[PDB]
Design a binder for this molecule. Structure first.
Ligand SMILES: *[C@@H]1O[C@H](CO[C@@H]2O[C@@H](C)[C@@H](O)[C@@H](O)[C@@H]2O)[C@@H](O[C@@H]2O[C@H](CO)[C@@H](O[C@H]3O[C@H](CO)[C@@H](O)[C@H](O[C@H]4O[C@H](CO)[C@@H](O)[C@H](O)[C@@H]4O)[C@@H]3O)[C@H](O)[C@H]2NC(C)=O)[C@H](O)[C@H]1NC(C)=O
Ligand SMILES: *[C@@H]1O[C@H](CO[C@@H]2O[C@@H](C)[C@@H](O)[C@@H](O)[C@@H]2O)[C@@H](O[C@@H]2O[C@H](CO)[C@@H](O[C@H]3O[C@H](CO[C@H]4O[C@H](CO)[C@@H](O)[C@H](O)[C@@H]4O)[C@@H](O)[C@H](O)[C@@H]3O)[C@H](O)[C@H]2NC(C)=O)[C@H](O)[C@H]1NC(C)=O
Ligand SMILES: *[C@@H]1O[C@H](CO[C@@H]2O[C@@H](C)[C@@H](O)[C@@H](O)[C@@H]2O)[C@@H](O[C@@H]2O[C@H](CO)[C@@H](O)[C@H](O)[C@H]2NC(C)=O)[C@H](O)[C@H]1NC(C)=O
Ligand SMILES: *[C@@H]1O[C@H](CO[C@@H]2O[C@@H](C)[C@@H](O)[C@@H](O)[C@@H]2O)[C@@H](O[C@@H]2O[C@H](CO)[C@@H](O)[C@H](O)[C@H]2NC(C)=O)[C@H](O)[C@H]1NC(C)=O
Ligand code: NAG
Ligand code: NAG
Ligand code: NAG
Lengths: 111, 230, 230, 111
């Protein structure tokens, strides 16, 4: 069962502080046996998990009802929230396996 | 007998309104002296506004009031007039009439003219979602607009590509303009509104603006630039 | 025909200049639609600037342009106009005309208006140096006034006591007005002038202005305020 | 013979930067055997001598023909020229004595 990793759009978000920064992770899923994870890269350059679908407080994931897309938002985004973000699909269908997205950049502009 | 100049006519006017000023003269032969209006806005200094000749045959104005202001005199009534049309907020000042030869020897005590607007800060302000973004062809982008006050569904979406005029995309916040692809979608009512591009195409390289049409001043959002990234 | 909106009139202007924009229409019943002027600063977003109803009986402006801008239309010639008076640096923008409904339907490709920062004055600019001052009674006070061009001796000094109108002190830069004490001195010619109070007195508490009467517009200084410490 | 110190007017000057800020030191001298100094209070209270009469290029002193008054001006006054100033009379007379004046303030506002 060869399946492709999810995609994480947009590649660059430039949000003013205090607003809601919304990424969109899209996953063409071979099965229903999977969860989704939203990672943010640390200064140590490995994934820190923020939130997962299904289930912090400022990191909410929602399932867009088209069966393909997910909204992963930063509510009241702070300045130091700028960094590298990505999503990852964890399949539970035969052979548990994690396939990360392409990393995307977030920039928060000061008011 | 002393020389006396008495001004009347000042009041509150809205910008673009009109006002007329009078100045009653006595104590000299009014027909042979040049008259002039000099004004002084609050806290600032003096500036000259208009001048009429003794016989009324010659008038003089600065560029700031030309076409707007018209000085006139009625030598039979010994009075001076200043007709102020299309008033601006900069015209707020105390206006003195004065006798002019090569100095202003006699001055009236002035009448206060105020040009102001009560609109203040009741304007609706629109803010837009990511200020800019960079996605690839085929991605699903979503753009939000926010209104300072409730506007129902009186929100508009425009698309402006570089070097071109804005194109109407969505009116009444859900409807789709003629000749717009079906991939553009609009949602929301009251304060929060969203523009969604179902599948980014190469011809969607543009900046997108929102606009409320509920009440004047009809305000726009800051815009959201969508780069098709390398 | 086919719907068409063409703008004309743009160009470069200096601050305080005048410019008139023309927008010519075709392809629809012009006398029935609201017409608009929307501008965009060279780097900024969109802001609405004027609107006129189909029959021309209703006008609407934002507060920033009221008293300066005038929208008008000639339905017989199917054209729209915008009279931009006393232009500021904030008016540099591309100016589009747009057929207006509860949305902006069709947009012209716009004309470009550029407000330079060229030309300083064109009028003789007066400059008083001390600009505010506090001395004890009996001190000697010196107020200088600088003219941009040569004005010979055509220089006037005015005193404005608090709450009252300006009063003539010195004319032709040296001669003293009647009823003025001898402690007031005037000197200079051409560009450099000086008002000297040989011994300050409490009754000299006021604001002092210089003024050239050489050429129009007759310009004043910024004023020099004289407090009295004791 | 007790001679009185000079007077320094005005007590406060508010001139916009780029303009000329002129002070007036008045001295009813008893003798011709005197010189004048113009001081400025440095942050350490050390009275810094700017110029003298008779004699930096920005600090000039001119003698008015009335035999009593002197003009002490700052040509093209910078904004940080704001501070405390005073004039001073040195007596080369039978006895050598310095007599400073009352200090005055100068403010240089922005354009
Ligand atoms: C790809 O994944 C999506 C998403 O799946 C959901 O989310 C992930 C995170 C997991 O938690 C999954 O377990 C979730 O299901 C798939 O999307 C779902 O597909 C199912 C397939 O039907 C949808 O099903 C159900 O819910 C609706 C109500 O919302 C029911 O009415 C459906 O039908 C029943 O009732 C019928 C009569 O009324 C009867 O005929 C049926 O027998 C049945 O009992 C059904 O139970 C679900 O709603 C979908 N969710 C979303 C968000 O789209 C997608 O199928 C996956 N694709 C592949 C190829 O695997
Ligand atoms: C108080 O001081 C003043 C000024 O003193 C001068 O300045 C100080 C700083 C020192 O350098 C002194 O050495 C200076 O004198 C006193 O005044 C001076 O008195 C002189 C006579 O005693 C008088 O005379 C000479 O010059 C006359 C022509 O003057 C020309 O120059 C002056 C500038 O100095 C100028 O104003 C004038 O217009 C002329 O161009 C001449 O007619 C005389 O015969 C004589 O040769 C000085 O002019 C005069 N200086 C000033 C500036 O007024 C004053 O006497 C002192 N008072 C007391 C009580 O001592
Ligand atoms: C920023 O988002 C918050 C919360 O986000 C919402 O929930 C997410 C899971 C996702 O579905 C988003 O699209 C939603 O908008 C907004 O929060 C308000 O929160 C208060 C509680 O403090 C609640 O009472 C309100 O109902 C919420 N409002 C809405 C519209 O959900 C917040 O308004 C958003 N801010 C901006 C500037 O958009
Ligand atoms: C500022 O001053 C200069 C010169 O200063 C003079 O000295 C002072 C003590 C003061 O009392 C001034 O009245 C003096 O003029 C002004 O410039 C000069 O203009 C003359 C014209 O004849 C010229 O010959 C000089 O060389 C010029 N000197 C300089 C230094 O420019 C200058 O215009 C003054 N500016 C203002 C705004 O007052
Ligand atoms: C970000 O800034 C907040 C201040 O509001 C601080 O509490 C938080 O620890 C910071 N986090 C990082 C990762 O810098
Ligand atoms: C010294 O400085 C103090 C403030 O620090 C001031 O009050 C005092 O007047 C100054 N004295 C002199 C002689 O400068
Ligand atoms: C004042 O500003 C000038 C710059 O014009 C600088 O060279 C000088 O060192 C400054 N002096 C002080 C005391 O700040």
């Amino acid at each position: 069962r060869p399946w492709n990793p999810p995609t994480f759009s947009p590649a660059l978000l430039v949000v003013t502080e205090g607003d809601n920064a919304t990424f969109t992770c899209s996953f063409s899923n071979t099965s229903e046996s999977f969860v989704l994870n939203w990672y943010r890269m640390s200064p140590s350059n490995q994934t820190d998990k923020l939130a997962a679908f299904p289930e912090d407080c400022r990191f909410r994931v929602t399932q867009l009802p088209n069966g393909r897309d997910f909204h992963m938002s930063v509510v009241r985004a702070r300045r130091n929230d700028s960094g590298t973000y990505l999503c990852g699909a964890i399949s539970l269908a035969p052979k548990a396996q994690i396939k990360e997205s392409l990393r995307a950049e977030l920039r928060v502009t000061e008011r | 007998m002393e020389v006396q100049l008495v001004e009347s006519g000042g009041g509150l006017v809205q910008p673009g309104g009109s006002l007329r000023l009078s100045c009653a003269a006595s104590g000299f032969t009014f027909s042979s002296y040049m008259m002039s209006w000099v004004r002084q806005a609050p806290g600032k200094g003096l500036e000259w506004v208009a001048t009429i000749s003794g016989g009324g045959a010659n008038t003089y104005y600065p560029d700031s009031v030309k076409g707007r202001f018209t000085i006139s005199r009625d030598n039979a009534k010994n009075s001076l007039y200043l007709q102020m049309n299309s008033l601006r907020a900069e015209d707020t000042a105390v206006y003195y009439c004065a006798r002019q030869l090569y100095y202003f020897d006699y001055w009236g005590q002035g009448t206060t003219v105020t040009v102001s607007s009560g609109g203040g800060g009741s304007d609706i302000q629109m803010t837009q979602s990511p200020s800019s973004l960079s996605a690839s062809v085929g991605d699903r982008v979503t753009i939000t607009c926010l209104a300072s006050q409730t506007i129902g569904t009186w929100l508009t979406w425009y698309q402006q590509k570089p070097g071109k005029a804005p194109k109407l995309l969505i009116y009444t916040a859900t409807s789709l303009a003629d000749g717009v692809p079906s991939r553009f979608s609009g949602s929301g009512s009251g304060t929060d509104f969203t523009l969604t591009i179902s599948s980014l195409q190469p011809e969607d390289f543009a900046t997108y603006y929102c606009q409320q049409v509920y009440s004047i001043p009809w305000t726009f959002g800051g815009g959201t630039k969508v780069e098709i990234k390398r």
